[PDB]
Design an enzyme around this catalytic site. Structure first.
Site, mmCIF file in Angstrom:
data_model
loop_
_atom_site.group_PDB
_atom_site.id
_atom_site.type_symbol
_atom_site.label_atom_id
_atom_site.label_comp_id
_atom_site.label_asym_id
_atom_site.label_seq_id
_atom_site.Cartn_x
_atom_site.Cartn_y
_atom_site.Cartn_z
ATOM 1 N N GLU B 58 16.404 5.644 59.548
ATOM 2 C CA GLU B 58 17.195 4.554 60.142
ATOM 3 C C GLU B 58 18.511 4.554 59.385
ATOM 4 O O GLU B 58 19.535 4.444 60.051
ATOM 5 C CB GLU B 58 16.539 3.218 60.084
ATOM 6 C CG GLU B 58 17.210 2.025 60.733
ATOM 7 C CD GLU B 58 16.706 0.694 60.327
ATOM 8 O OE1 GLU B 58 16.364 0.419 59.160
ATOM 9 O OE2 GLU B 58 16.645 -0.058 61.293
ATOM 10 N N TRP B 80 12.737 1.161 66.912
ATOM 11 C CA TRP B 80 13.809 0.570 67.722
ATOM 12 C C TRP B 80 13.503 0.677 69.214
ATOM 13 O O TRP B 80 14.394 0.315 70.006
ATOM 14 C CB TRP B 80 15.182 1.192 67.448
ATOM 15 C CG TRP B 80 15.840 0.521 66.299
ATOM 16 C CD1 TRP B 80 15.921 0.941 65.019
ATOM 17 C CD2 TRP B 80 16.482 -0.767 66.324
ATOM 18 N NE1 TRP B 80 16.569 0.018 64.221
ATOM 19 C CE2 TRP B 80 16.941 -1.027 65.004
ATOM 20 C CE3 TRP B 80 16.702 -1.709 67.314
ATOM 21 C CZ2 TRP B 80 17.593 -2.201 64.662
ATOM 22 C CZ3 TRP B 80 17.374 -2.866 66.998
ATOM 23 C CH2 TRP B 80 17.823 -3.109 65.697
ATOM 24 N N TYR B 94 24.797 -1.586 64.690
ATOM 25 C CA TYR B 94 25.145 -1.137 63.378
ATOM 26 C C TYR B 94 26.009 0.088 63.251
ATOM 27 O O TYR B 94 27.142 0.023 62.796
ATOM 28 C CB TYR B 94 23.879 -0.928 62.504
ATOM 29 C CG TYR B 94 22.993 -2.135 62.466
ATOM 30 C CD1 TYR B 94 23.278 -3.254 61.690
ATOM 31 C CD2 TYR B 94 21.848 -2.174 63.251
ATOM 32 C CE1 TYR B 94 22.415 -4.365 61.662
ATOM 33 C CE2 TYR B 94 21.005 -3.291 63.263
ATOM 34 C CZ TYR B 94 21.278 -4.365 62.457
ATOM 35 O OH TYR B 94 20.405 -5.421 62.504
ATOM 36 N N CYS B 146 21.031 -8.086 62.322
ATOM 37 C CA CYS B 146 20.280 -8.986 61.450
ATOM 38 C C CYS B 146 20.863 -8.984 60.062
ATOM 39 O O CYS B 146 21.022 -10.019 59.451
ATOM 40 C CB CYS B 146 18.809 -8.661 61.389
ATOM 41 S SG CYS B 146 18.059 -8.659 62.982
ATOM 42 N N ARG B 166 21.529 -12.718 58.110
ATOM 43 C CA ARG B 166 21.529 -13.954 58.885
ATOM 44 C C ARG B 166 20.180 -14.433 59.352
ATOM 45 O O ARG B 166 19.934 -15.631 59.489
ATOM 46 C CB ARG B 166 22.489 -13.805 60.087
ATOM 47 C CG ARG B 166 21.834 -13.128 61.276
ATOM 48 C CD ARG B 166 22.428 -13.241 62.603
ATOM 49 N NE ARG B 166 21.808 -12.353 63.528
ATOM 50 C CZ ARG B 166 20.661 -12.437 64.120
ATOM 51 N NH1 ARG B 166 20.003 -13.585 64.172
ATOM 52 N NH2 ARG B 166 20.116 -11.362 64.692
ATOM 53 N N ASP B 169 12.797 -11.479 59.093
ATOM 54 C CA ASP B 169 11.354 -11.498 59.350
ATOM 55 C C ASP B 169 10.815 -11.033 57.995
ATOM 56 O O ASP B 169 10.911 -9.833 57.782
ATOM 57 C CB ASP B 169 11.142 -10.466 60.453
ATOM 58 C CG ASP B 169 9.713 -10.181 60.840
ATOM 59 O OD1 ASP B 169 8.871 -10.633 60.073
ATOM 60 O OD2 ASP B 169 9.498 -9.545 61.918
ATOM 61 N N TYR B 209 6.594 -15.052 60.930
ATOM 62 C CA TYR B 209 6.175 -15.332 62.302
ATOM 63 C C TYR B 209 4.816 -15.985 62.218
ATOM 64 O O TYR B 209 4.154 -15.643 61.269
ATOM 65 C CB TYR B 209 6.175 -14.086 63.129
ATOM 66 C CG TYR B 209 7.572 -13.845 63.618
ATOM 67 C CD1 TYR B 209 8.062 -14.551 64.706
ATOM 68 C CD2 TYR B 209 8.417 -12.938 62.991
ATOM 69 C CE1 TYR B 209 9.358 -14.352 65.189
ATOM 70 C CE2 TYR B 209 9.690 -12.723 63.496
ATOM 71 C CZ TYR B 209 10.178 -13.458 64.576
ATOM 72 O OH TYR B 209 11.435 -13.182 65.067
HETATM 73 N N1 LIG Z 1 10.631 -9.537 65.262
HETATM 74 C C1 LIG Z 1 11.469 -8.533 64.804
HETATM 75 N N2 LIG Z 1 12.353 -7.881 65.644
HETATM 76 C C2 LIG Z 1 13.189 -6.864 65.167
HETATM 77 C C3 LIG Z 1 13.121 -6.483 63.831
HETATM 78 C C4 LIG Z 1 12.162 -7.161 62.880
HETATM 79 O O1 LIG Z 1 12.120 -6.806 61.705
HETATM 80 N N3 LIG Z 1 11.350 -8.205 63.456
HETATM 81 N N4 LIG Z 1 14.020 -5.435 63.395
HETATM 82 C C5 LIG Z 1 14.990 -5.670 62.318
HETATM 83 F F1 LIG Z 1 17.214 -5.609 62.883
HETATM 84 C C6 LIG Z 1 16.323 -6.296 62.191
HETATM 85 C C7 LIG Z 1 16.090 -7.820 62.650
HETATM 86 N N5 LIG Z 1 15.196 -8.640 61.708
HETATM 87 C C8 LIG Z 1 14.403 -9.665 62.363
HETATM 88 C C9 LIG Z 1 14.986 -11.030 62.108
HETATM 89 C C10 LIG Z 1 14.430 -11.739 63.349
HETATM 90 O O2 LIG Z 1 13.091 -12.133 63.099
HETATM 91 C C11 LIG Z 1 14.538 -10.718 64.471
HETATM 92 C C12 LIG Z 1 15.860 -10.751 65.284
HETATM 93 O O3 LIG Z 1 15.852 -11.989 66.075
HETATM 94 P P1 LIG Z 1 17.160 -12.889 66.107
HETATM 95 O O4 LIG Z 1 16.570 -13.934 67.118
HETATM 96 O O5 LIG Z 1 17.401 -13.540 64.822
HETATM 97 O O6 LIG Z 1 18.297 -12.096 66.577
HETATM 98 O O7 LIG Z 1 14.471 -9.405 63.817
HETATM 99 C C13 LIG Z 1 15.158 -8.376 60.365
HETATM 100 O O8 LIG Z 1 14.538 -9.048 59.552
HETATM 101 N N6 LIG Z 1 15.850 -7.293 59.839
HETATM 102 C C14 LIG Z 1 16.579 -6.367 60.568
HETATM 103 O O9 LIG Z 1 17.266 -5.479 60.033
HETATM 104 C C15 LIG Z 1 14.413 -4.470 64.305
HETATM 105 C C16 LIG Z 1 13.351 -3.369 64.567
HETATM 106 N N7 LIG Z 1 13.004 -2.870 63.176
HETATM 107 C C17 LIG Z 1 11.608 -2.671 62.811
HETATM 108 C C18 LIG Z 1 10.578 -3.062 63.699
HETATM 109 C C19 LIG Z 1 9.259 -2.827 63.378
HETATM 110 C C20 LIG Z 1 8.886 -2.196 62.183
HETATM 111 C C21 LIG Z 1 7.421 -1.926 61.828
HETATM 112 O O10 LIG Z 1 6.551 -2.293 62.653
HETATM 113 N N8 LIG Z 1 7.162 -1.293 60.601
HETATM 114 C C22 LIG Z 1 5.722 -1.083 60.422
HETATM 115 C C23 LIG Z 1 5.480 0.424 60.665
HETATM 116 C C24 LIG Z 1 6.419 1.650 60.613
HETATM 117 C C25 LIG Z 1 6.058 2.601 61.817
HETATM 118 O O11 LIG Z 1 7.003 3.001 62.523
HETATM 119 O O12 LIG Z 1 4.813 2.776 61.993
HETATM 120 C C26 LIG Z 1 5.401 -1.569 59.027
HETATM 121 O O13 LIG Z 1 6.428 -1.724 58.324
HETATM 122 O O14 LIG Z 1 4.203 -1.719 58.745
HETATM 123 C C27 LIG Z 1 9.929 -1.800 61.293
HETATM 124 C C28 LIG Z 1 11.242 -1.997 61.610
HETATM 125 C C29 LIG Z 1 14.889 -5.093 65.581
HETATM 126 N N9 LIG Z 1 14.059 -6.210 66.038
#
Ligand SMILES: [N]C1=NC2=C(C(=O)[N]1)N([C]1F[C@@]13=[C]N([C]1[C][C]([O])[C]([C]OP([O])([O])=O)O1)C(=O)[N]C3=O)[C]([C][N]C1=[C][C]=C(C(=O)[N][C]([C][C]C([O])=O)C([O])=O)[C]=[C]1)[C][N]2
Ligand SMILES: [N]C1=NC2=C(C(=O)[N]1)N([C]1F[C@@]13=[C]N([C]1[C][C]([O])[C]([C]OP([O])([O])=O)O1)C(=O)[N]C3=O)[C]([C][N]C1=[C][C]=C(C(=O)[N][C]([C][C]C([O])=O)C([O])=O)[C]=[C]1)[C][N]2
Lengths: 264, 264
Positions: B58, B80, B94, B146, B166, B169, B209
């Protein structure tokens, strides 16, 4: 204020000597976070007298989308003087990004109005942000935005805001930034019918200029007095309709002011 | 890791129940800051096995300025997938902002190369920033950034970086963000001939979550093992020439992996 004097001390005890743009020299720390619950009081520094007229008008100026120091001058605010051009222009600094961020495709985005819409229609959104860091226009600004990105948050019917301040002059700059943002939170919350929550300040390069050391020792020896109370006398029709005279700071009794030179 | 399990607990003890975009429900806190000294070890979570192949690719993907999940697929990275269009496009997320932020005036700014230039010519600058929050293009991105803005800092010959995330998770997202950024700091520092300093993480809406509660209790009962060591085997000619095979994570011995569903 407790948190602010604690920041000052930490810069003193932990800062490393650093050269700077201005040629002044600073003691610097990287990365600091402090939190102000706004229900406890208006976070206006008490260990030195702060110029409220300057703080209020700079804010109102930002909200109009203005970048010309004229409105400031009209109001006897001269804090932006050293950076303005021949015409009193600063370039597309704060006000312009807040109210009319120019888009690649030739559009203008009013982030302030976008924010109002999100707070009124999607309060749980994790995307309520205002950014003044418009990469495609930094070359035109007199100074890069110091307070550069802030995020709003709603929980339990209270409005909170977090500011990312990339660079902070702890002595001159901080007291102003804090109050300023506390003020905006109070305004947004009144407009949205919320109560105020927290003001979270996060800093990048947080420093004390080397020619503010005496001023610092001085302030560090004073005991914080109680936070005043902010009263907003009327509820304008919009975030764009507040007037200086709409605000009242109740019970502000600070120690005396400390002069310090601004680094240019 | 100590700091990460402490964040998890705090979300448990202090989060307020919040509705979210995904319709899942979370426990949320606003405003958190943690610091990792990179000289102590590579901050890769040990209380659960992390998929390094996904983290590394990534990052390499971001650095190429790519927004098409094809390169990921070619490499058996499928994280993604849920957000990509019919063609595997995510929009100008990004990579595109990092490498080619489009300007009002029709130009493209490579913030990564700008950063390299500032670190090599003006290390004390308080303006070494990369921002992915391009207001004029949020409507085109599949997901708003994010991790949205980070700043570099040099002191004492060490490179530090602060990220403003900002939305976080904590269970799925955080472990990846942390390692990812730690990796970039190590790469920039090698390219600039600096030692690594600190990774400062700052969060906005930091949450768990609701369908990750069992996973959380589980992880919270495991004791952190020792941080591994990152070895970069060669020094590419540029920040754009690293290969997966150039990195070695020495002594990573994690507890077993915990599956958790991703909220879309
Ligand atoms: N729910 C969710 N969605 C998403 C994500 C996560 O982490 N979670 N990611 C990431 F751009 C970013 C964002 N973030 C979060 C914060 C919140 O919660 C969301 C958004 O909404 P608003 O309403 O605020 O706008 O998101 C963070 O923290 N950071 C950042 O940078 C993305 C996708 N990425 C991923 C997904 C999944 C995974 C896994 O599952 N890993 C596993 C395995 C490995 C293989 O492949 O097998 C472990 O680690 O175990 C990773 C990464 C977008 N969306
Ligand atoms: N040095 C300086 N400069 C400036 C400032 C300050 O503060 N300081 N400001 C401010 F936007 C801002 C920025 N900041 C700072 C940081 C640093 O240090 C700088 C920049 O650089 P770089 O390199 O990083 O880029 O800056 C901060 O902190 N913040 C922010 O926001 C401005 C102007 N403003 C002002 C000035 C001054 C004053 C004063 O003096 N005050 C006094 C008085 C009042 C009457 O008026 O009188 C007291 O307070 O006492 C204020 C304000 C720009 N620049």
């Amino acid at each position: 204020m407790k948190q602010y004097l604690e920041l000052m001390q930490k810069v003193l005890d932990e800062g490393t000597q650093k050269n700077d743009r201005t040629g002044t020299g600073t003691l610097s720390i990287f990365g600091h976070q402090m939190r102000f619950n706004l229900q406890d009081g208006f976070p206006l520094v008490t260990t030195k007298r702060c110029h409220l007229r300057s703080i209020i008008h700079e804010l109102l100026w930002f909200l109009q989308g203005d970048t010309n120091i004229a409105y400031l001058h009209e109001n006897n605010v001269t804090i932006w003087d050293e950076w303005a051009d021949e015409n009193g222009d600063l370039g597309p600094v704060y006000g312009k990004q807040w109210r009319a961020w120019p888009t690649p495709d030739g559009r203008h985005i009013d982030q302030i109005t976008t924010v109002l819409n999100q707070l009124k229609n999607d309060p749980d959104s994790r995307r309520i942000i205002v950014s003044a860091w418009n990469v495609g226009e930094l070359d035109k600004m007199a100074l890069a935005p110091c307070h550069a990105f802030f995020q709003f948050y709603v929980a339990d019917g209270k409005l909170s805001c977090q500011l990312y301040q990339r660079s902070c002059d702890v002595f001159l700059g901080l007291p102003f930034n804090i109050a300023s943002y506390a003020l905006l939170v109070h305004m947004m919350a009144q407009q949205c019918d919320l109560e105020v929550g927290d003001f979270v300040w996060t800093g990048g390069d947080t420093h004390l200029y080397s020619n503010h050391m005496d001023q610092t020792h001085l302030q560090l020896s004073r005991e914080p007095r109680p936070l005043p109370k902010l009263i907003i006398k009327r509820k304008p029709e919009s975030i764009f309709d507040y007037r200086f005279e709409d605000f009242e700071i109740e019970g502000y009794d600070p120690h005396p002011g400390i002069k310090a030179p601004v680094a240019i």
